[PDB]
Amino acid sequence: QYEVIKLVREWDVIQVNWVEVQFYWLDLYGILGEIQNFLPLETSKFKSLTSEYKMITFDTTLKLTIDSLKMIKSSLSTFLERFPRFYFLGNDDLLKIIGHDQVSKFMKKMFGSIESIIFFEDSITGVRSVEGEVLNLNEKIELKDSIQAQEWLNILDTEIKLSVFTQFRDCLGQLKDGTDIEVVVSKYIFQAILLSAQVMWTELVEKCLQTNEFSKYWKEVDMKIKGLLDKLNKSSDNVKKKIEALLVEYLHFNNVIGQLKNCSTKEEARLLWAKVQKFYQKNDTLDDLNSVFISQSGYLLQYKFEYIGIPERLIYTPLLLVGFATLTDSLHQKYGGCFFGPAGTGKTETVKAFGQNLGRVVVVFNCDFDYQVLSRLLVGITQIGAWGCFDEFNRLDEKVLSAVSANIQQIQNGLQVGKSHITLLEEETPLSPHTAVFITLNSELPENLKKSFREFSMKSPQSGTIAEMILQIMGFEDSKSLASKIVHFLELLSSKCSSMNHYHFGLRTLKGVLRNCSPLVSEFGEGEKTVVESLKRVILPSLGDTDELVFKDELSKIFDSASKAIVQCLKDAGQRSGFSSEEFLKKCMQFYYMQKTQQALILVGKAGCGKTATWKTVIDAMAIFDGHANVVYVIDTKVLTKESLYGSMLKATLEWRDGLFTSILRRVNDDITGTFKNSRIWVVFDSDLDPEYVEAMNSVLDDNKILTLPNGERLPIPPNFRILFETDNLDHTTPATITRCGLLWFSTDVCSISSKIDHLLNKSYEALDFELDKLKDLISDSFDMASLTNIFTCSNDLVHILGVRTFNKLETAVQLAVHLISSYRQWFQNLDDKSLKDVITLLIKRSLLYALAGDSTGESQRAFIQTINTYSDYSTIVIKLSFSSFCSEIPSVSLEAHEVMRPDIVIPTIDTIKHEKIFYDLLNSKRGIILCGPPGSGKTMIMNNALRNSSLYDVVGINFSKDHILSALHRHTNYTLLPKSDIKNLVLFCDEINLPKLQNVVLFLRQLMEKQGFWKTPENKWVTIERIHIVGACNPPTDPIPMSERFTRHAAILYLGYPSGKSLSQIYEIYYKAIFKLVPEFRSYTEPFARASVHLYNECKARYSTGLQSHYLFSPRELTRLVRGVYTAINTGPRQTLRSLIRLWAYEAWRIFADRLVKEKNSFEQLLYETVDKYLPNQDLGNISSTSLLFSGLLSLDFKEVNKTDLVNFIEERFKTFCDEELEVPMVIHESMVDHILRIDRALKQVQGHMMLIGASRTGKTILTRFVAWLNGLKIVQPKILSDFDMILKKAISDCSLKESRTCLIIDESNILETAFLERMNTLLANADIPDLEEYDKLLNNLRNKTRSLLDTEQELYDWFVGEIAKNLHVVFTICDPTNNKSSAMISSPALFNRCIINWMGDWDTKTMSQ
Amino acid sequence: KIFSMLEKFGQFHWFYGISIGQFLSCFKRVFIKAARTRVDEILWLLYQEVYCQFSTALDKKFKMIMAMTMFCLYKFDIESEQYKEAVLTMIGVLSESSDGVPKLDDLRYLWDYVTTKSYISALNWFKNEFFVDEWNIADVVANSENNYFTMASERDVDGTFKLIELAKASKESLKIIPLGSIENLNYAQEEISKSKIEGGWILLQNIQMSLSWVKTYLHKHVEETKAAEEHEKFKMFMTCHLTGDKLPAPLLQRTDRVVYEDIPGILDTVKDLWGSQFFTGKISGVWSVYCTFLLSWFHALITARTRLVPHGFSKKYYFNDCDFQFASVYLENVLATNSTNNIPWAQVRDHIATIVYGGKIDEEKDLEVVAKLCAHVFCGSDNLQIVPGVRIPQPLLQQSEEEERARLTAILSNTIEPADSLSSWLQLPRESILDYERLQAKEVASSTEQLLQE
């Protein structure tokens, strides 16, 4: 329970609905309650809901809240009758409007043409258009407190209508009295002047049509066009818009009159005059609002006198007039108009223009936007009588498509019948006879909707005439030639260029070019130069290199025409920040011109082309050029959720909590310090273009420039606040944002490989803290670009795991070389120049080796060593300075017999020391490290060894899956974020990095490595990281999810190959010595067993490849398993002999290697006999057949070879006891089952032994596993089959841990149903357990109680718990018919394959089936 | 083998599948009702009954293919080998896949048909010399115990009037209830309930318009019930469209399926348009009836040309009665508002060929051909030949509406349509229609070869 006072403190304590009502009431009391007398019926409803709200503030109370919501909805429904424009607004918007004193910005939604209301002393005097045009009422409406909201809204709407009528009548009276248009244009609104000019034009053409003359009125309208064109430049902005939008209509008049004059016959002229729209006026009717009607092709429509302002006016073309006449013919019989064709043909604009020409504001719908807004808008339009244009109607969802098609069919039926009332939204709504419905299409209309409409197809309109008259509007001398040239260029651009998905060259991009040419033509002057420069600045940023070549060639072909201070500023900014080219200069100028002309851009190109460098250097050049103080923000979009990015409001309480972008916009809009007068603020969104993330700023990117927030707030975007998007590709992007936002395309790299090598070194020295200058000169002279370019080009021939370009690994090379040279600083003052040169060259050689050859095989590494040396293999530098070898650093280790079973013990070979030293070198360089290789090769092992034996780094234990790391990191770091230790750094061990599925966490790692920090989600603040590094290990190309180069580019990639035969022989020789210290009398045989083991391993690797069966994968982990099995056999056996030892080795090798085989077993028997004969020629070896090698401890106290008869008699007795005590199955007992159960028992006795069984159905794998489990005393658990799987796994772990219960878990293939279960068991089987699956604190305290009954830091506690849960848990996976996709995914999964032992029971043979 | 051929028919289109119980019922209908012996007479009766039962579920191409495949299957087992070689040779010549003179009494007439390039006559050779029976709509409805019928047809072709004629001939009342809105759905539900509880025929137009009703309501209606109540002369009908979205397959399997073909009689559809027009308006009969006559002719030549997909048009368009209505109201308006009787036929020509009849059209050549047809029809000259057989005089200034209506009806009635109505009347070259017939023959014969090779 919280504290109530409207405002609620500590809300995180039916309650959801209650606090939703609380938030709605907070808004209601803040707007109406605390502006109230403007709604008396709503005031009575407010009082009733106040009584109910004070009553509640529980089933009756919830019913009262639902009744209050229904009462508010019914109050809006009553506000429909008496007003019907709130349907453009939501419920909360309608409430805040009925809450015009200090309220605005919502009239654009309901009217569509007005922006603000002009007031004077609590009285309405006029409205202001969106484009700034000023409207003056005929009579000022006096506003009083007691007038209702709907009442003054209605009187304002009627006053607007009557004022437009009055101004039109006055304009027509002035025009008929000989006053020219350039005198009346400065008084009244554009709509009235437009209607008067249109009516006067119609009357004059009709009057001169009765006889045959046209040249008089043609010359008159030409002179009027010239007068308007002369007056345009000497006018204000609103007057400029008025003169432009009237001069386009005067060009239309001149076009019509010129077409009429050229007609040979009067019948042809009458035809063409019937084809053109006509504007008449009736002088008999007393009703003022219907005094003007519409004539087109004989049919008649009526004017409605609605305010339009000065919207963008379509240029009049013959296709436009044909569409107008088609809509006229459809609407005459009360039908609707349907349009279809290719995209970018002007369907929505011709519908908008047809509505605009009749003086009615159409309502335009866009589709991608649910059913409720569609139904509400349709009801509002049918009540008002407006018109409601369904854009991308084919793109709507099928269910809402059927619903809105039924609604449109009902509307058309009402229009055909002429019904007074329409039944829509289960209510009898008044149906005006002035309504209309229009649909535009790109498939076709549904047939039930097709039958009631008129489908009309348009092509691309006469873009030549459109461009000509647009150029004529702005005042170009030769509009027609330039228009023909530019439309020809756009056609050739759409024809010749590549079919890239963002190459759009329709009419919209041409209109954008013409729009953007205006400041450029003011700055440079009219002609071909201004249009070619606008064309360059619009089209060049989005083209590729060959696209740029075609663009340049064609532009030079057709067009005749072919600021040094800003160049100097870019050069100075690049020199100051350390960046460093013709391509870089071209991209800098392109971005400069876009940021001069466009307010929003997207940055895209190949990874590491210099996009961040480009925009950072242009922003610094803007700082030094314009003098503006520059602040820059870089945001990674996908690391945070969209709700966290744009302001997280909990839907439970509907309470607004600010986001980081929301906080940035609030700081921008508030402007507390006032520095914004000369400040341009930049937020760069550096991640891929998610349509869901980017569509929240659709109004921001467009001309609206207003941010739409979920709570209804509207924070403006100033012109100096520009948004950038850094991405890699345009795969998941709609063409709407592509044409809407400027696109800068980095086709290839900027080269500058000589210039690149200096920035890395300079920032390396800048990141640090007489000899410094000398070492800098030595490094710079050693970095000879002539040899380095050849080495880099030759480096591409090697195979690279996680293939990253050579231009993107130079960071690792330079950082490592600089760190290595800086590490030897104190031993530089007492040595000659030649030895310094040799040492520096050798260190650079090592850094280049480990950068350009890390991700290659050992053979490829040696090949690159040889080639680079011709341009040693294990060269090193030891503590004067001298050249030495890696081989001399190998130590010697002598472990105990029981120390073999510990997995954390490695044996230091040459490659182990080499990998550990370079891992230290790269870690101390503060660079990310990724090690790749086949499973079992020793990546995780070498990282744990390098991290445990060092006094400079600590270990964080994090486990990954398909679906965090920072959660455990919060318990090891201190808040800037610092490591808890003041000496050792902290490094992030992130294992199984391929496991997350596409990805947020990989981009979080990229954010931590690149920008060296992250944004705190609940606090919306930037924290910088000081001493945390990131490492990982996977093999991407062999995984049955490739990563973005933008992440792996910031990390060093090294390949970790399999140990050689000699290395394996040495390490397992030491293992054999350790286990043979138990039986010292046979210590002289250590070498033959080791050589036999490694030879058998490589033979099994070469023979039984994965190309035969999927699970035929052999890795040196099997050898460790074999040695551990041999140790467990020796330690739990009697005094053995040489024959006993060789038979034990043969049995264990057979069990480890051959148990995956189903002929193959005979081949393995032959191989075992061959290896025994070749390597161990001992007397009476034998015991290599399947039935000749039976080892078990089921008969006595120790492990030894057994005879068949006693074993089978004992197992029959135990099985009859099992049948008498456990479930009874009529099982026939045969030799293969005895062999299988022997191997299962020898697998189950091993600590942390997990297993999975492959075989055909009804082979008996589960029943034999259950029998051996009962025989071996384990506790059986059967999954009674995500929440259930999680709880049964938690129950198994808790029962195993808190009660010390040794469990055998039998998981069948039928149990798994989704990939989440597979991921859960993959996590559980990868390490010992999955702790992720107040409960955590309860488990921790029970863990402490158990530990004290049976260690202070959480690390040792966690390790002890892991060892306990590993020792007492075994899991068995029963899987059958591996041809199944789910079964194949389970087997081939890397997490479950490595830990479990693979058992192929296979199908029955002839002999076993015989007995 | 014939069941395999019918399954391969069902493989081509969604509407052409068959069940097995229907096939067994058709087989037992052979015996429930001498070719040199008794067993061969049984086999002949089996083939004839099966063909007449399964021929009306197909269009002209599939039923003609089925007829010729069944004839080949009969002849290839009873007749000798040289007959099979000659048949495959002539079929390969028909599909332009094989060349060679056949090895030569009925086959002489077949060769005469083939060398004359009269391919539909070659199909009639099969259908007449072998089969001696054909089934119409009345034969289908009379010879079936089912109560559901699906009568599909191509767009711009409807056979509702055929079912009305059948119901009038059956002395049974037909209820025509179109769909398209939720009110229409409620009306259909209450009407079908009233029919199922009391009786009387119900016919639903375009249930594909209510394909949502198909998957949810109709599926729960017809599949979740047995045979309906055995009322006297009480049945339920349904119609659909072949060219659109597929309906639910089990609903097809649970009903007898009929495909209705077109009626492209140009004079017949002029008569159908003229006889259904109740002439009334501000302009009684001085020019409105003449303009309606010209518009009926124009709609006839434009709705018959759309049947020839690759030659008459460049794409299968669909013109319907709404286009006729809007053209009629435009003609009424231009005639009413221009009483000087110097009627601007250019306005009518342009408004028909750009907005009224040129709206749904996309290609330029099809706009050109519609403009050509409208210019030929709406030329407005003193004497015009709407077809090479009929000449239409303009109305004189001394008649009423009744005299002019009777005169135009008499001009319509005495006309006899020639056999080349699709060629001579639509102003098309005979070479183009011959090439279209050749392409149809090649498609049919290639489908037959593909059927017979498996």
Ligand SMILES: Nc1ncnc2c1ncn2[C@@H]1O[C@H](COP(=O)(O)OP(=O)(O)OP(=O)(O)O)[C@@H](O)[C@H]1O
């Ligand atoms: N003149 C230059 N030529 C080439 N590269 C340069 C130059 N100057 C600096 N660089 C380096 O090029 C790098 C290019 O990084 P870039 O921003 O293009 O990478 P990205 O992965 O595509 O994107 P982001 O880093 O924004 O996520 C810069 O980080 C900088 O260190």
Ligand SMILES: Nc1ncnc2c1ncn2[C@@H]1O[C@H](COP(=O)(O)OP(=O)(O)O)[C@@H](O)[C@H]1O
């Ligand atoms: N008279 C005109 N003058 C200039 N541009 C036009 C004109 N008519 C149409 N357009 C162009 O047509 C585009 C409208 O695209 P449209 O074909 O309506 O696509 P959609 O139907 O998906 O909205 C506009 O961007 C505009 O540039």
Ligand SMILES: Nc1ncnc2c1ncn2[C@@H]1O[C@H](COP(=O)(O)OP(=O)(O)O)[C@@H](O)[C@H]1O
């Ligand atoms: N040089 C080596 N010395 C000892 N053991 C090694 C060596 N190289 C690889 N191994 C074996 O490789 C296995 C580790 O491989 P890997 O799967 O990468 O690590 P983990 O098993 O910890 O996930 C260990 O079981 C170890 O026995």
Ligand SMILES: Nc1ncnc2c1ncn2[C@@H]1O[C@H](COP(=O)(O)OP(=O)(O)O)[C@@H](O)[C@H]1O
């Ligand atoms: N010796 C045997 N070998 C194979 N199947 C047997 C044997 N004895 C009994 N069965 C049958 O096998 C069934 C148990 O097999 P089970 O292991 O559950 O199959 P799966 O191997 O597919 O899991 C019993 O119901 C029994 O009928």
Ligand SMILES: [Mg+2]
């Ligand atoms: Mg591991």
